[PDB]
């Protein structure tokens, strides 16, 4: 049947659609079943249908966004804002609440408003992709570099709004976000920071402004539709060098992490955001599962050994980058070798030293860690047919015992539900994002349901061990928010109060981060 | 006459006081005229009496803070939270709204809850001063260092909650804040970030947690009473060196700033937060005004030259610190000399090369910039009798011309109101906090009034030129918030909406940052 917003009739939904067309143009509102297929989660989770959009609206400007918001308030139509809608692993462009209208800001609001070479910043609309900004920087012979996630087709803005991550020293996107413009849930427009001071030139210079600092409240949030965002850009260093350290054993995880911490916490000699990837992650990037194993169930030990040998990789593979004058690089690299060289079986390779298939990941990281966006990691989804992934993404202390515990816990369930567990620890100064990608066949109802049930188990079991997720998929948002229930669910109650105050009609992305406005609470969708 | 909360009778106040004594104990509620004299602003602004507390309550736990808040809500009594109450220049411990009860959290909530050597952080109650944490670190032979403002008697927490600043690489306090516990305006308690996850070890490891990120909303804010805060701590480097560069001309300001920017924006060779201080600031630190000029008006140029010559300082004096192995320090100092040595008249001194009176500020910065707290700068307040100061603190782009225009704009009004303009530019990566301290005799009603009128003029003039303040005094909060009125006052309306939703009875620090809850709006308070 036609997907309709909750509580809204065919007839009223038709009238609302026409008003959206009055604002944006007929070509810029999609509402047929065929046209909406493209906006389904590409990596669906759960057997049953879920996260169904009712329409897609593509506004050209902040004023059109305002008008759309006003219409949605009058009709009681929920709006789900995206930038580019490439949140794959977490839902793609699909709304948490079925029946919502997707507001695809990035389709037409895709301008680079300013790149300031002197002060090292950009001012962006939501449709500027990493590729788009890279092209700009290259075209203008900029001395600045961007910080990108693994896939360059996402949005500088949109990735930041979900507190996404990259891998240069500017890898904490939200840290470097400076100023934003947002349309609030009843249609009012607001600028944060120094941008609230008319005529200031400091909107991208000083993030805080005056008074309570609100920008974080627009991240992983349903408090508005963001229309402009600033971000600091790092100066490109004079030289760089990337390296891979292979570690032979699953059980080396503990020592790897413990040796890493003292080298990272001061931002030297580990200057970039290191990643520690398991052999499933690296093999999926360069090969299909049937190259190593075509039986049933989890891949046997002997098959794991063949991936390692054929690709010349370890069970754990550490990738980092160094920057600066050549002698600084050499000094740092020497320190890294000496430290991690304690682990029996450790082998080191720079980006100049390996040109082979297994080395493809190191070459990709050398691009990414130098702000050169890439789509090479899309190959991961060829690991099994109709491949998809979901991101289960607990936070870990930068402690080997903790990391090992988390690894063992996830691996036990992955094996039990027959899903391959590819791991990427993303290593900050004092924490790691432990990204667990389960790669699966999206066509098969039981695969999708095992994914859902396995990840619900892992959310709960992680939380019982004191671990929480940094980011999650539409299907897990209620379960993850339910783990952050210190003080009798104080955090969620606080969010809901602000939600209801700013969005009295319950319009913007209901259910994002488990935050449902009053009219939807307790309805279980 | 007895100071009472607004619309609260003598008897209703006496009843409240009793309820507060029941919670905290008799000794820990102050309510006599002369016990309250000590909580008046030490540097009063304006001729007329303002910012009068009705009582001070000193809780020993979060549970007590919750009960005090519940009592206040029942009675309609405003509560103005402070940590140590040393926000001198901006109000001291005094409340914005006369008749509020000061909640002096730090008197008895003064425990160092954790200092973690491995992960480099502290979890703190509000009463922990910089001197307290320093003593802890020294006693335990820690490898960590703290980051302090110029006066060590403040609160690690309280300073961060007003987005205050220090001078090491960790000098953006709010940037390094990681987790907090807050009592919300009806008495609910909440932990942010990973602290919301029961049993997490990552409260001080990963700041954002899950969902909308709220910690900024409790800074320069009246949304709660903070009871615990975490902060990252830097590893002490193996060596450090501080330096002074003196510049001879008032007109050198533009070139100093333009040369500085490329050396600062990448955190090297200017690793620390540089300060650029004028001769008035440095002379006040070491000498009284009457040493150089006796006369009620602006200091003549010949007296300025005498200050410079006797103290062997410039009109502009640049202070920085370098850290790391001794060869790194040498490369960076050499670069700094080569760049700033292009300004005619520039002279360079390390912390080993001055033992004279004018060198005293260098020695003090060498402490501060190494996380060694000091109160030597209290000498500034001896510039004139009964000395006080107010901070007029605009943000500047790191542009020489902008810094010069601000300098000239402020200097001109200072002349007109007969106040000396002491300047300290605090230089971030992409912005400067341009702190203007006006030092005056707090005992002369007319001087307190000129300070008020002058600074009201400066706020308006600066906003007409596109400059806003990062932080301000109780007397200026409304005027400063009024400058940030892009989009017909959008930012303030947003803040009011949240305030009213969290604080329906209008209890917590009414008027902080210009944010008044519903029962107080449109009033002359
Ligand atoms: C499958 C996968 C995913 C992945 C990755 C590797 C693989 C194989 N590596 C990643 C990495 O290195 N770092 C990282 O942060 N994420 C990584 N991913 C996940 C995903 O690809 C990316 O994060 C991607 O950049 C996110 O998608 P996009 O950038 O297109 O962002 P979006 O879908 O438009 O928005 C995400 C959410 O943010 C909120 N949002 C977005 N725009 C707005 C506006 N304008 N206003 C309000 N809120 C907005 C929404 O919640 C939206 O859903
Ligand atoms: C006169 C002066 C001041 C000064 C300075 C040099 C001189 C000569 N140099 C400074 C510097 O280098 N950096 C800096 O940040 N400030 C400097 N100042 C100003 C002042 O001395 C310090 O900032 C000082 O540390 C601040 O005072 P304190 O640390 O005691 O903090 P507070 O008065 O307790 O709190 C300030 C405000 O924060 C909010 N607050 C505080 N505690 C709470 C709790 N628990 N809950 C909610 N809000 C709280 C209040 O708004 C409070 O007024
Ligand atoms: C190789 C995968 C990287 C990744 C990093 C961070 C994420 O949140 C993520 O989500 C699917 C994926
Ligand atoms: C020497 C003055 C330092 C200072 C720095 C930052 C401030 O906000 C400030 O305010 C009174 C003072």
Short mmCIF file of C-alpha atoms and ligand atoms in Angstrom, two decimals, chain A residues 87-90 149-150 163-165 167 277 281 365 377 380 389-393 423-424 426 433 435-437 470-471, ligand 3:
data_model
loop_
_atom_site.label_atom_id
_atom_site.label_comp_id
_atom_site.label_asym_id
_atom_site.label_seq_id
_atom_site.Cartn_x
_atom_site.Cartn_y
_atom_site.Cartn_z
CA UNK A 87 24.72 6.84 6.22
CA UNK A 88 25.25 3.24 5.10
CA UNK A 89 25.55 0.83 7.98
CA UNK A 90 23.29 2.99 10.05
CA UNK A 149 35.96 9.04 6.29
CA UNK A 150 36.74 5.84 4.34
CA UNK A 163 29.74 12.63 14.85
CA UNK A 164 31.55 10.67 12.20
CA UNK A 165 35.21 10.23 12.02
CA UNK A 167 41.86 9.68 10.15
CA UNK A 277 41.84 -3.86 11.38
CA UNK A 281 38.17 -6.46 7.34
CA UNK A 365 44.80 4.32 3.97
CA UNK A 377 36.41 0.34 0.37
CA UNK A 380 34.12 -4.77 1.07
CA UNK A 389 26.87 -4.21 6.52
CA UNK A 390 25.68 -2.89 9.82
CA UNK A 391 27.87 -1.00 12.20
CA UNK A 392 27.95 -2.14 15.82
CA UNK A 393 30.23 0.53 17.30
CA UNK A 423 36.79 -5.16 13.15
CA UNK A 424 38.29 -1.66 12.88
CA UNK A 426 39.69 3.81 15.41
CA UNK A 433 35.81 3.56 18.51
CA UNK A 435 33.73 -0.55 14.82
CA UNK A 436 32.34 -4.01 14.20
CA UNK A 437 31.01 -4.42 10.70
CA UNK A 470 29.02 5.97 19.89
CA UNK A 471 26.60 5.76 16.94
C1 LIG C 3 35.89 0.34 7.78
C2 LIG C 3 34.70 1.00 8.47
C3 LIG C 3 34.80 2.31 9.12
C4 LIG C 3 33.77 2.87 9.87
C5 LIG C 3 34.15 3.86 10.78
C6 LIG C 3 33.29 4.44 11.61
C7 LIG C 3 31.96 4.05 11.55
O1 LIG C 3 31.00 4.61 12.35
C8 LIG C 3 31.53 3.12 10.60
O2 LIG C 3 30.14 2.88 10.62
C9 LIG C 3 29.61 1.86 9.73
C10 LIG C 3 32.41 2.49 9.76
#
